[PDB]
Design a protein around this ligand. Structure first.
Ligand SMILES: [Ca+2]
Ligand SMILES: [Ca+2]
Length: 79
């Protein structure tokens, strides 16, 4: 939104690699769940898949980095 900056990018990137326990460049529902779980959040399994599927514009069931920018870009909706 309003053109992303370096800080919002680098911070996003660090956040994403950070979520990648294996640093394989992919976030699975388990890793995402580890985080959501640890974040006082408790999504249902179907929900995580569905949540991923909304961003899975590609259809892989996992999150890459740009897919993660979309996810966080929409999330940052907080106007
Ligand atoms: Ca992974
Ligand atoms: Ca995807």
């Amino acid at each position: 939104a309003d053109q992303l900056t370096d800080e919002q990018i680098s911070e996003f990137k660090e956040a994403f690699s950070l979520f990648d326990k294996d640093g394989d460049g992919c976030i699975t529902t388990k890793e995402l769940g580890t985080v959501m779980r640890s974040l006082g959040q408790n999504p249902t399994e179907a929900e995580l898949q569905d949540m991923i599927n909304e961003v899975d514009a590609d259809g892989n069931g996992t999150i890459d980095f740009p897919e993660f920018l979309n996810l966080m870009a929409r999330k940052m909706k907080d106007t």
